[PDB]
């Protein structure tokens, strides 16, 4: 697992394309924040 | 995902990489702080195939930069896009091997690539998805053409079935800036057929000519034959990092390319090139852009290619376009000229089509030849070689740092053969 | 082969031995004489003064 | 509610000291003139006194003025209370009898009613913590005779002593070992835990990472200070584990003798090269476990190891943790004793670490700070004590002590209880 | 505030105080009219350590001057910065000694000692926590080498728990002044095993080889001699007096510097010392002070260190500095001369900072050391006494006034058996 690693912070769009960013894409649309707010 | 990882060593290398990156960067939309400011969506849709993203978003090239001498970096690094480099993969000397392939390769090479090895090592296993490797250098600079064929000896031991990609300058005789080349040239090659996957042949007295010939410009400069280099090498892994009617990666160049294992060497050629006087008066068009593709004049080599008979050549078109129109172009021109096709290979043209062109140009073209022609440059070095090698001048250096005149012998036969069996399938018959 | 402490001596005006030490002495006492110039603190300076 | 009371004795102790209350003042946003500008997680380090400004809950030592009187004159004078800034009035030299035997009574009885005054005004003390320099006659003397004192006076109360031990090739002072076995002995039996903190290795990791070829104490200071303050953010900050001070002395000490531990920090990066690089979770545990990011100058592929407490700060997610916890294990060039299968604690807390103006050390989002208990180290107290013997055979600088009213026996039961201890430690590595 | 104060008898003793007094009143800004006008807080707060405070803001000196002639205290007073001292610590005598031990010793000392004594004590007890006592004498005359010893006898029975320092100019063989001088010299140093805590040696025919090899200055005068000798000792109570990063006072340089009750003689050295052309054309660093300072012909003694073996040494950095710099040159500088250093103590080298460089510097070094060699001094002295013995010359002038051989003979008895202990810890192997 070497998830996160070459995706960083990016809002809307088709993205980067490596790890899981069909599955990130749709999270961030249906709502903000795709992955793990910031505490 | 299918990544490439960047290295260059030695002085032309450096100075290849550092117009390189430059033409990757403003492709991608990248300014020198790293930070991304394209239009299009594709712009960021393969950036993997390059950079990598660091905290906060910012990209940084996974090129690792390596030479014996650290003047060459100092230039560099204050110039256009020199931030962008990883201040940690700067891996330099502290004597020089003044040219001399024997230092280069033996005494401070044996000491200096630990460094450059592990940090290879540590992107290689960091990056998900490995495609292969390409380097960058010259076979007439001692550093180069000694260190920069030691790390392809033992990167291809610890990777045997990845691709691997080599650009070598050679020298040409008409333009010699250096007296030791046949030496270093030919102990080079010996080990570069030996582990290269592909090896493309670079000509400066090429460019120069095509620069005077075709652009008509008065002043050339080192900074235009970099540029020609630098969209030369985009133009071949844009199908790789965009898509296209039929993409072609480099494992599929490789193997539509290479019929045996040894006959590994190309020649490259760009498209279109015209002046700036001239531009508003030509048409871009399929026809003319093939025309001016398979031009004898317009390869970056000195071979002529219509001095013997192609194994089989390959061309990227970048931009929009009909298939079928390439396609009976190709049929013409493979027709047209069948003298100059050997015959029992019919059908060696591989073709293929990327969606998105250079920016500022509708369409584009890049050729990759794999021919019999190049048979004559080394023939050539090797009558320098020999020159050099009957009187033993210039010998006692390279035999005083551990060589000896056996492993000069070894490798001049090899050569030799090279050319033999290289020049055996161009009259053969079916 | 230029040896010091030779016997006689002579000024720093000739080249005996040892000149350039004695002369750049010399300079820097003229040069710390001008630095006392500079900050008024000569003593003749208050002699006349009173 | 839940504070600690910091003890700072001998001059290398208040030279870190007045670093880690510069971090933490700077951190709880507290200007040195001692009030918040106002444009409950500080009671851990300060109580308020009432209407706007705040003291420190810590107590300086030093037998000789010069520090304590400069930092009177320092940026901090109205931070401290004036009469908790205790000073003697001549220097122990080196002596461990001057500081044990002949001038201590008279600065201890009023340093522990200080001790006593302080713990009145708190309701929830969890410990102490303590800081000082071993091969220095006050700092060693005094902090003997503070711990033991306070072992009689509180006793089952914890304590944390970060004691800066003699490096094994550089140093500064020749009598170094006599009083650096002498503390040892002392501080034995009355420490819970004690934590190394030679300065050999902080050389070689600041010339290595931070590419500094001219460092002084005050990057070392500062390291130590951000070690701290990693150490206990969990007291004062929330966290998806919180860990308590008193665990420690449940979670890293299978044996009451074995006690002594050795640290590391990561990252470790300067600030021009901070941008170019990943600062994973996986890549900053990897960098923690290697050899020559170890806080001591010992090596730990030398032995097995017994206990490991890593604490994370900042964007830290479990799932990361436990990725890299099970390469770790994974991972053949460490191994663990055999009768300690499970040997990991981990805390987590959601504060990223504070950055200090002008400081070395860059803006970062994720760090750890890892501390471990190993057999290995017996190496020190071995090449120690063999330091000791070799010029204690023939009885040299023996009239210096033996002079100030110190026995001459002592020496041979501090020999034995050495002796004792390394035999522990290299029975306690072998297999069951 | 741990202070010291100074006694100083015999003309040597008085100029080598007088030029002292002028150094320190320099660094500590104060005019001869006792008056501070300096520019520094941090020159104040520790003025108490040297300088007692009067009616009108004034400071004075607690130094107390002792002979038998008036001749050299009205030369003192009449000299540059005389006002500083009080006329009440003038004792001297109306007669004088003319270079003989038992007049100085016996006879006069013991009836006008009593003066000076009560003014000490007095003196002594006025200030609040007294750390030390320092004496600055030769052993090479007559009032000062009985005074100075009487004086530290009983003032060392007065107060046992506290340390004295004593700087001995030691009669060199080499450059003579009086044919009785090895008398004296055994005869007092004889009583100095026993009381003085920290002897440390100075020659004048060192001093002037310091002078003359290294400041290259062509005609010194005792004024250059008297300047080195006050800045050596200036160099060793700095740490009392300004703040650093690493403080050492008298008593931890005794207890890291003396290994045994009777091996409390010391050889100390200065840096950096160079003539008047390199003052500006070289570079002050650290690797090149610790180069300095560690040579041989650097030395303020006759004695040659590199015919013996150190026991123990230490320096006192003065300046800005860096820590890890400072610990690696004194390894390396340990390592590479192990043949140097006595192998049954390890790390035999102490290092102190101080903040505070001297003026018009802005880095020095002044070094302290306890070397095998010293017994050299001793050997011939001991041998001229011997030989001038065997015959009885000029014994009548001594013993006319209570004195015996018997004592003369224990003197050189003593003389022989600390050469005997002091030597065998040379080849003394574990
Ligand atoms: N890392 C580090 N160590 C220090 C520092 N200051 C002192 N030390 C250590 O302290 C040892 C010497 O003792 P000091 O601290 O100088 O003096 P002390 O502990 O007060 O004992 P005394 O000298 O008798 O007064 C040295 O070996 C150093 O290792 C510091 O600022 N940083
Ligand atoms: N394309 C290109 N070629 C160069 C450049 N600089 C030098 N060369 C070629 O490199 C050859 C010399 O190589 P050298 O500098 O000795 O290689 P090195 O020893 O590795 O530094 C010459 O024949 C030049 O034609 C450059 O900036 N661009
Ligand atoms: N360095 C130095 N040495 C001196 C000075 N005055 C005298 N001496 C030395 O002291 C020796 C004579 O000592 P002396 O005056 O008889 O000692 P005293 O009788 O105790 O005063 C001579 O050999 C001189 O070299 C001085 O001002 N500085
Ligand atoms: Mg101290």
Same mark, same amino acid.
């Given at each position: 697992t070497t998830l996160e690693s070459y995706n960083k912070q990016l809002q809307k769009?088709? %993205?980067?394309?490596? +790890?899981?960013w069909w599955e990130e894409r749709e999270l961030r649309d249906v709502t903000? &924040?795709?992955r793990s707010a910031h505490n | 995902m299918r990544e490439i990882v960047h290295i260059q060593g030695g002085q032309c290398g450096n100075q290849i990489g550092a117009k390189f990156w430059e033409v990757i960067s403003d492709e991608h939309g990248i300014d020198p702080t790293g930070t991304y400011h394209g239009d299009s969506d594709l712009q960021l849709e393969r950036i993997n195939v390059y950079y990598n993203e660091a905290t906060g978003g910012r990209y940084v090239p996974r090129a690792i930069l390596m030479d014996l001498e650290p003047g060459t970096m100092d230039s560099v690094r204050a %110039?256009?896009?020199?931030? $962008?480099?990883?201040?940690? /993969?700067f891996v330099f000397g502290?004597?020089?091997? +003044?040219? /001399?392939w024997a230092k280069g390769h033996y005494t401070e090479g044996a000491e200096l690539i630990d460094s450059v090895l592990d940090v290879v090592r540590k992107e290689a296993e960091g990056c998900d998805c490995l495609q292969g490797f390409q380097i960058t250098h010259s076979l007439g600079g001692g550093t180069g053409s000694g260190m920069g064929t030691l790390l392809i000896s033992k990167v291809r031991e610890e990777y045997p079935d990845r691709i691997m990609e080599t650009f070598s300058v050679v020298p040409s005789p008409?333009?010699?800036?250096?007296?030791v080349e046949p030496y270093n040239a030919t102990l080079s090659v010996h080990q570069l057929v030996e582990n290269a996957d592909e090896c493309m042949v670079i000509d400066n007295e090429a460019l120069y000519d095509i620069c005077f010939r075709?652009?008509?410009?008065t002043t050339p400069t080192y900074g235009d034959l970099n540029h020609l280099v630098s969209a030369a090498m985009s133009g071949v892994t844009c199908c790789l990092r965009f898509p296209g009617q039929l993409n072609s990666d480099l494992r599929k160049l490789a193997v539509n390319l290479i019929?045996?294992?040894?006959?590994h060497f190309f020649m490259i050629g760009f498209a279109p090139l015209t002046s700036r006087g001239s531009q508003q008066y030509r048409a871009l068009t399929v026809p003319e852009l093939t025309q001016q593709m398979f031009d004898?004049?317009?390869?970056?080599?000195?071979?002529? =290619?219509?001095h013997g008979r192609y194994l089989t050549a390959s061309a990227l078109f970048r931009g929009r376009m009909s298939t079928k129109e390439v396609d009976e172009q190709m049929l013409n021109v493979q027709n047209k000229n069948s003298?100059?096709?050997?015959?029992? &290979?019919?059908?060696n043209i591989k073709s293929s089509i990327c969606d998105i062109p250079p920016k500022g140009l509708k369409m584009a073209v890049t050729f990759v030849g794999n021919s019999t022609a190049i048979q004559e440059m080394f023939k050539r070095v090797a009558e320098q070689f020999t020159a050099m090698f009957r009187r033993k001048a210039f010998l006692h250096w390279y035999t005083?740092?551990?060589?000896?005149?056996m492993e000069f012998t070894e490798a001049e036969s090899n050569m030799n053969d090279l050319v033999s069996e290289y020049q055996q399938y161009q009259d053969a018959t079916a | 082969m230029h040896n010091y402490n030779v016997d006689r001596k002579y000024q720093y /005006?000739?080249? &005996?031995?040892?000149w350039s030490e004695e002369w750049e002495l010399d300079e820097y006492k003229m040069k710390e004489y001008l630095k006392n110039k500079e900050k008024q603190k000569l003593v003749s300076t208050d002699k006349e003064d009173r | 509610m839940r504070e600690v009371i910091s003890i700072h004795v001998g001059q290398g102790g208040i030279q870190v000291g007045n670093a880690c209350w510069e971090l933490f003042c700077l951190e709880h946003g507290i200007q040195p003139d001692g009030q918040? =500008?106002?444009?409950?997680?500080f009671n851990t380090f300060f109580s308020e006194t009432g209407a706007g400004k705040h003291v420190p809950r810590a107590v300086f030592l030093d037998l000789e003025p010069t520090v304590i009187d400069e930092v009177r004159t320092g940026t901090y004078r109205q931070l401290f209370?004036?009469?908790?800034?205790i000073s003697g009035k001549?220097?122990?030299? /080196?002596?461990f009898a001057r500081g044990h035997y002949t001038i201590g009574k008279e600065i201890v009885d009023l340093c522990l009613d200080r001790i006593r005054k302080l713990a009145d005004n708190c309701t929830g003390l969890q410990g102490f913590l303590v800081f000082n320099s071993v091969g220095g006659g006050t700092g060693s003397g005094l902090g003997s005779l503070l711990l033991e004192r306070l072992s009689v006076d509180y006793g089952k109360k914890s304590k944390l002593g970060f004691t800066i031990y003699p490096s094994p090739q550089v140093?500064?002072?020749?009598?170094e070992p006599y009083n650096s076995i002498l503390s040892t002995h002392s501080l034995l039996?009355?420490?819970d835990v004690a934590v190394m903190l030679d300065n050999e290795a902080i050389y070689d990791i600041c010339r290595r990472?931070?590419? &500094?070829?001219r460092p002084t104490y005050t990057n070392l200071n500062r390291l130590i200070a951000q070690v701290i303050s990693s150490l206990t953010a969990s007291l004062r900050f929330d966290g998806a584990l919180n860990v308590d001070i008193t665990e420690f002395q449940t979670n $890293?000490? =299978?044996?009451?003798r074995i006690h002594f531990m050795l640290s590391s920090y990561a990252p470790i990066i300067s600030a021009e090269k901070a941008y170019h690089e990943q600062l994973s979770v996986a890549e900053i545990t990897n960098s923690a476990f290697e050899?020559?990011?170890?806080?001591?100058?010992?090596?730990?592929?030398?032995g097995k190891y017994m206990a490991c407490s890593m604490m994370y700060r900042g964007d830290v997610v479990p799932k990361d943790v436990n990725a890299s916890i099970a390469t770790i294990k994974t991972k053949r060039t460490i191994q663990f004793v055999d009768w300690c299968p499970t040997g990991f604690k981990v805390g987590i807390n959601y504060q990223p670490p504070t950055v200090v103006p002008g400081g070395d050390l860059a803006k970062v989002m994720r760090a750890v700070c890892m501390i471990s208990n190993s057999t290995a180290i017996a190496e020190v107290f071995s090449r120690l004590d063999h330091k000791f013997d070799l010029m204690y055979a023939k009885r040299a600088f023996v009239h210096w002590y033996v002079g100030? +009213?110190?026995?001459? %026996?002592?020496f041979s039961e501090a020999r034995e209880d050495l002796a004792a201890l390394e035999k522990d430690y290299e029975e306690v590595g072998i297999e069951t």
């Open positions: 769009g088709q %993205g980067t394309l490596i +790890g899981n903000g &924040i795709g | %110039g256009p896009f020199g931030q $962008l480099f990883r201040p940690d /993969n502290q004597t020089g091997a +003044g040219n /001399n008409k333009v010699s800036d250096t007296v075709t652009l008509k410009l019929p045996f294992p040894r006959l004898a004049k317009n390869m970056m080599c000195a071979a002529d =290619p219509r003298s100059y096709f050997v015959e029992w &290979i019919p059908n005083g740092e551990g060589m000896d005149e | /005006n000739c080249r &005996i031995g040892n | 918040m =500008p106002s444009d409950d997680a209370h004036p009469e908790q800034l001549e220097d122990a030299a /080196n002596n140093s500064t002072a020749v009598v039996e009355h420490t990472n931070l590419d &500094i070829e $890293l000490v =299978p044996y009451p050899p020559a990011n170890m806080m001591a100058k010992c090596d730990p592929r030398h100030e +009213g110190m026995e001459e %026996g002592e």
